[PDB]
Design a protein around this ligand. Structure first.
Ligand SMILES: [Cl-]
Ligand SMILES: [Cl-]
Lengths: 212, 212
């Protein structure tokens, strides 16, 4: 017979569509080795929906792009994710580098629908002020946004973690620096102040910071 | 001065999240060369939302997994996308091959939320009849579903086109054949019967069939 006897057990973690496919792959491989009793149940959803789920106790912690509205929550910024622009190789001649937005055709910049925080972060961080350059057809996923660029329709802003995880592979794209010397987004963890699991969240924050 | 003068112009194409990241990359590279004046505006959304958009004339054509409810629309099946199961390498010993669902632990099969047609297609095609094997926490994207499997939490069904496009890269997974000799989903194009662009859609259908 036998005698019966913080990074242990189950965690429900939410993450946005422009981070989850990329960073969470690395996070899972790291915690598999370093914290092998931690089981991560994962939710992918856009920022507003994740915040509601967090406030309602349906998720324990979020990995978000910041800043976004997170009134009343605890957060910790864990790193920075640079922005690049991308263009198809077959349109790369028709656009000169360094990029000056004023020299692009009108309606040449494709962006995600506004429910995705990537658009607000990229437009402000990369200083796109001329709305006439934005194409009126809004993209609805990062993959189909890139595919439209790969089809030659224009340009867009892409996070570095997507490039590092192969999003552009076999799509014959060229990666360009955007305007601005603050062309990145912050990445952070967000949780409830009343949570008893702060020690767990801060250990996870350290792991995530090492992946950025 | 100068004199002024079917696969030409703009097409709005909708596609589901478990196809769009994979097949559309190939489709864009093929049409870039074969039909260079065809501009593809892309929408990614789940099946029900795409059907509404198609019926309302907000999209021209869909690439769907079939069968799903498409009353009143024209469709054409263009190929078959096999299913596989996946498990983490570190749990691969604890699950014997060939897979018999009855020998899996209860709650070991993770599935997408029901708004994603992958779950109905995979469960019927791969003959999962024992609901006790399904984990009650539903996944909300194909990427985070795979990441939970990579974390060792269980197993799931994945479409072959995702495997062929590198979804499992660097996640230390093992690919297994599911039960059944009809373990695949049909892929098809769907459009309005009153459309005047049938010649365009049938040419696109031929291109897509060559990618499967
Ligand atoms: Cl978002
Ligand atoms: Cl769907």
């Amino acid at each position: 017979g036998a005698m019966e006897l913080s990074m242990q057990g189950q965690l429900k973690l939410g993450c946005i569509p422009t981070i989850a496919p990329f960073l969470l792959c690395d996070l899972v491989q790291e915690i598999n080795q370093r914290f092998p009793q931690l089981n991560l149940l994962l939710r992918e959803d856009t920022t507003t929906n994740l915040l509601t789920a967090l406030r309602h106790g349906e998720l324990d912690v979020l990995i978000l792009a910041l800043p976004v509205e997170i009134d009343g929550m605890e957060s910790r910024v864990v790193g920075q994710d640079p922005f690049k622009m991308v263009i198809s190789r077959h349109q790369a001649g028709a656009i000169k580098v360094p990029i000056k937005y004023d020299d692009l055709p009108d309606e040449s910049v494709f962006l995600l629908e506004k429910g995705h925080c990537l658009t607000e972060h990229a437009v402000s961080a990369c200083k796109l002020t001329d709305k006439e350059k934005i194409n009126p057809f809004s993209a609805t996923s990062l993959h189909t946004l890139v595919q439209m660029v790969a089809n030659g329709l224009g340009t867009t802003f892409i996070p570095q973690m997507a490039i590092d995880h192969g999003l552009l592979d076999n799509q014959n794209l060229v990666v360009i620096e955007p305007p601005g010397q603050q062309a990145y987004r912050d990445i952070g963890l967000v949780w409830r102040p009343s949570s008893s699991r702060s020690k767990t969240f801060n250990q996870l924050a350290e792991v995530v910071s090492e992946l950025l």
